[PDB]
């Protein structure tokens, strides 16, 4: 396939994941982009992946999965987790613009507006709870705030699954290689060069200074097993968020928490939603 | 039709050739390489593109064309020019390593060594005169110095056709778009991503500090028409070299000098060699 994928595979083998992510971000600058939400390529129509109880569909929060940055991801991302929401809550997955041709966002705000427009449309008057994993968790928070500040519509809550925000993603750097190896282990097919570019541009967006903090209550869900050797003399390897409303620990690592242990993620969510309501 | 060429196509459209060359150099670091000239993956056998007079078979210097960095280039770079050397001089084109899964050179010196070894094998006991055009002209000079100091075989002369050496080469930066546009026109086929990366890597080698000067006399051949617009204000737009043996001006621009007007470049070389 593409040269970017082959270069990345080598960088990962050489333990230079971070360096190549910078190269992707620089190269993404030369892709055509959209400078206004209404100029976005794709239909950002959210897909219904689970349906809540018909007896009670009116006043209850609906869940919206915020697709993460992984170049190997897309519509498969919340398949496993969503199953556990069937007959409990509507679960809607919103695509991240610029993936599976597609113009890349000029800046993050522009992408977030396009998602906001599409989520408000599908959700209607139901309160929204945003959910994301890993970089998708950082995206879920930036979206929540944008919704509050730019659209005057704060979500009723945010579920952040293993967020590593700037100021404390040191374990994520030490686990760099395992992170890169995890991208390759997860491909159902070769990651396209265009999607690697989109990943690099978003990673760069997410490293930048974004001081807006959402007023929505946060559930912080954390992996219980380390992805790699750590050694706690350095401090905590675990995911972090400032002042969470509730924290739930679940089995598995940064990656396995979302597959084999997805039901435990779902159970903490459902239980947190009942309390909040 | 890989992504690097599509990005490069867009960069040239947006007048950002310089910036994108930097991205190619950066990305090139992640391609497999060779650290020793012996580890070079390809055969750098020079190809004979013109033959000298069957008559005289004495000393007689042999022209060695040092292929440039163009990702759309290769064995066809000197075809037009060499025609004018037929029945005058042997003309040999040496390939530039890393083009045509070819390992890229870890640094410039490693590439010049692999070239120096193949040139010596071909040139036998004859004197060698390097010739290069534009970035190939810079390469020709860096190779001459490498031949002289690391192979104990100093060339008998160097022809630098429209060179724009670092730190004092601005017009070629201002004519950026025209170069990128020139790469696309003239592609016999789509430039591969591996060759674009090779081009980026050499470009960066050639922007770097290289004090070593060759002892061989230089013929500086300069284009007569500007490639693009240029304010009569500050600056001669012309190619340049420090203290050349002879300077020769020929019709055409940076590009056409090697095409329609190649015979004029050839005339200048023959005359100069005759001394």
Curated annotation (Swiss-Prot), chain A:
Changing residue 177 to N: 3-fold decrease fo the catalytic efficiency and 3-fold increase of affinity. The active site is at 134 (nucleophile), 254 (proton acceptor). Residues 71-270 are annotated as: Thioesterase. Keywords: Acyltransferase, Antibiotic biosynthesis, Coiled coil, Multifunctional enzyme, NADP, Phosphopantetheine, Phosphoprotein, Transferase. Changing residue 162 to A: Retains significant albeit reduced thioesterase activity. Substrate binds at residues 69, 135, 162. Changing residue 134 to A: Loss of thioesterase activity. Unable to catalyze the biosynthesis of the 14-membered ring macrolactone narbonolide and 12-membered ring macrolactone 10-deoxymethynolide. It comes from the Bacteria. Involved in the biosynthesis of 12- and 14-membered ring macrolactone antibiotics such as methymycin and neomethymycin, and pikromycin and narbomycin, respectively. Component of the pikromycin PKS which catalyzes the biosynthesis of both precursors 10-deoxymethynolide (12-membered ring macrolactone) and narbonolide (14-membered ring macrolactone). Type I modular polyketide synthases (PKSs) catalyze the step-wise condensation of simple carboxylic acid derivatives. Organizationally, type I PKSs are arranged into modules, wherein each module is comprised of a set of catalytic activities that is responsible for a single elongation of the polyketide chain and the appropriate reductive processing of the beta-keto functionality. A minimal elongation module contains an acyl transferase (AT) domain, an acyl-carrier protein (ACP) domain, and a ketosynthase (KS) domain. Cells lacking the TE domain are unable to produce methymycin, neomethymycin, narbomycin and pikromycin. Homodimer. Pikromycin PKS consists of a combination of multimodular (PikAI and PikAII) and monomodular (PikAIII and PikAIV) polypeptides each coding for a functional synthase subunit which participates in 1 (monomodular) or 2 (multimodular) of the six FAS-like elongation steps required for formation of the polyketide. Module 1, 2, 3, 4, 5, and 6 participating in biosynthesis steps 1, 2, 3, 4, 5, and 6, respectively. This is Pikromycin polyketide synthase component PikAIV. It comes from Streptomyces venezuelae. The lineage of its organism: Bacteria, Bacillati, Actinomycetota, Actinomycetes, Kitasatosporales.
